[PDB]
Design a protein around this motif. Sequence first.
Motif, PDB file in Angstrom:
ATOM      1  N   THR B  45       0.827  -1.206   0.000  1.00 17.46           N
ATOM      2  CA  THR B  45       0.000   0.000   0.000  1.00 17.46           C
ATOM      3  C   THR B  45       0.861   1.256   0.000  1.00 17.46           C
ATOM      4  O   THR B  45       0.632   2.184  -0.791  1.00 17.46           O
ATOM      5  CB  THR B  45      -0.935  -0.013   1.210  1.00 17.46           C
ATOM      6  N   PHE B  46       1.890   1.272   0.851  1.00 16.82           N
ATOM      7  CA  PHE B  46       2.801   2.407   0.927  1.00 16.82           C
ATOM      8  C   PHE B  46       3.541   2.608  -0.391  1.00 16.82           C
ATOM      9  O   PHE B  46       3.626   3.734  -0.900  1.00 16.82           O
ATOM     10  CB  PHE B  46       3.786   2.196   2.078  1.00 16.82           C
ATOM     11  N   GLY B  47       4.054   1.518  -0.971  1.00 18.37           N
ATOM     12  CA  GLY B  47       4.787   1.627  -2.220  1.00 18.37           C
ATOM     13  C   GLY B  47       3.926   2.071  -3.385  1.00 18.37           C
ATOM     14  O   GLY B  47       4.337   2.925  -4.175  1.00 18.37           O
ATOM     15  N   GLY B  52       3.032   5.765  -7.256  1.00 18.20           N
ATOM     16  CA  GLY B  52       2.022   6.206  -8.203  1.00 18.20           C
ATOM     17  C   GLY B  52       1.794   7.705  -8.178  1.00 18.20           C
ATOM     18  O   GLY B  52       1.707   8.339  -9.234  1.00 18.20           O
ATOM     19  N   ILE B  53       1.711   8.296  -6.980  1.00 15.04           N
ATOM     20  CA  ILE B  53       1.520   9.740  -6.899  1.00 15.04           C
ATOM     21  C   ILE B  53       2.772  10.478  -7.372  1.00 15.04           C
ATOM     22  O   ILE B  53       2.675  11.500  -8.069  1.00 15.04           O
ATOM     23  CB  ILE B  53       1.096  10.128  -5.471  1.00 15.04           C
ATOM     24  N   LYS B  54       3.961   9.948  -7.058  1.00 13.11           N
ATOM     25  CA  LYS B  54       5.195  10.557  -7.543  1.00 13.11           C
ATOM     26  C   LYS B  54       5.310  10.479  -9.061  1.00 13.11           C
ATOM     27  O   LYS B  54       5.741  11.445  -9.703  1.00 13.11           O
ATOM     28  CB  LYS B  54       6.400   9.888  -6.888  1.00 13.11           C
ATOM     29  N   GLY B  55       4.924   9.348  -9.655  1.00 17.76           N
ATOM     30  CA  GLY B  55       4.959   9.228 -11.102  1.00 17.76           C
ATOM     31  C   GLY B  55       3.954  10.127 -11.795  1.00 17.76           C
ATOM     32  O   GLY B  55       4.256  10.713 -12.839  1.00 17.76           O
ATOM     33  N   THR B  57       2.821  13.008 -10.591  1.00 19.21           N
ATOM     34  CA  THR B  57       3.330  14.369 -10.450  1.00 19.21           C
ATOM     35  C   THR B  57       4.487  14.641 -11.405  1.00 19.21           C
ATOM     36  O   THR B  57       4.542  15.708 -12.025  1.00 19.21           O
ATOM     37  CB  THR B  57       3.748  14.617  -9.000  1.00 19.21           C
ATOM     38  N   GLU B  58       5.407  13.683 -11.558  1.00 18.50           N
ATOM     39  CA  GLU B  58       6.535  13.868 -12.468  1.00 18.50           C
ATOM     40  C   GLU B  58       6.083  13.932 -13.924  1.00 18.50           C
ATOM     41  O   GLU B  58       6.612  14.733 -14.709  1.00 18.50           O
ATOM     42  CB  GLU B  58       7.552  12.748 -12.267  1.00 18.50           C
ATOM     43  N   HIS B  59       5.100  13.106 -14.300  1.00 18.26           N
ATOM     44  CA  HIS B  59       4.562  13.156 -15.654  1.00 18.26           C
ATOM     45  C   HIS B  59       3.869  14.484 -15.933  1.00 18.26           C
ATOM     46  O   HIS B  59       4.053  15.073 -17.005  1.00 18.26           O
ATOM     47  CB  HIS B  59       3.597  11.992 -15.869  1.00 18.26           C
ATOM     48  N   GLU B  60       3.091  14.987 -14.971  1.00 19.34           N
ATOM     49  CA  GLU B  60       2.437  16.276 -15.169  1.00 19.34           C
ATOM     50  C   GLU B  60       3.437  17.429 -15.189  1.00 19.34           C
ATOM     51  O   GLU B  60       3.222  18.413 -15.907  1.00 19.34           O
ATOM     52  CB  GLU B  60       1.386  16.500 -14.089  1.00 19.34           C
ATOM     53  N   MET B  61       4.532  17.326 -14.428  1.00 15.86           N
ATOM     54  CA  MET B  61       5.582  18.341 -14.479  1.00 15.86           C
ATOM     55  C   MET B  61       6.258  18.370 -15.844  1.00 15.86           C
ATOM     56  O   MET B  61       6.532  19.450 -16.385  1.00 15.86           O
ATOM     57  CB  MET B  61       6.621  18.088 -13.386  1.00 15.86           C
ATOM     58  N   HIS B  62       6.533  17.193 -16.412  1.00 12.39           N
ATOM     59  CA  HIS B  62       7.102  17.138 -17.755  1.00 12.39           C
ATOM     60  C   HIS B  62       6.132  17.685 -18.795  1.00 12.39           C
ATOM     61  O   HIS B  62       6.543  18.378 -19.735  1.00 12.39           O
ATOM     62  CB  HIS B  62       7.499  15.709 -18.107  1.00 12.39           C
ATOM     63  N   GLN B  63       4.838  17.391 -18.636  1.00 18.82           N
ATOM     64  CA  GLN B  63       3.834  17.920 -19.555  1.00 18.82           C
ATOM     65  C   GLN B  63       3.750  19.438 -19.477  1.00 18.82           C
ATOM     66  O   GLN B  63       3.608  20.112 -20.502  1.00 18.82           O
ATOM     67  CB  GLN B  63       2.471  17.297 -19.256  1.00 18.82           C
TER      68      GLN B  63
END
Lengths: 61, 70
Positions: B45-47, B52-55, B57-63
């Motif tokens: 659950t923690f992982g 998932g939230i980090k990925g 956020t990183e995808h939206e930052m790149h976008q």
Amino acid sequence: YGRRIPKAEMFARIDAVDANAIRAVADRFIYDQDMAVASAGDVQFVPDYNWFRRRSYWLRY
Amino acid sequence: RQNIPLREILYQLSPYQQDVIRQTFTNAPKTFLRFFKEKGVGLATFGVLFFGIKGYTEHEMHQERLAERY
């Protein structure tokens, strides 16, 4: 013993024990040896085996 | 110290009538599998939440960097 020890021999054996012999016998039988501990009744405050085992020897000497 | 009413018989063996480190090599895979079975759901659950939230956020930052890109 397979015999009857005369009282003269028992007295001579007892009379041959000095302080050095007592020290040597206690050093053979007691010092830094395992022991057996048994208890009964209200024994919740009796120490466990490691407490008894550590007090068979002296680190001060 | 308190008085606990209790009826039992306790047996203890000397530390010098036992092996010290020889059942660790036998119980090592069972301990590993039991640890991961017992704490598997929480670690998953923690992982999943963290990565998932980090990925996302990183995808939206790149976008957002690509949206302002000339």
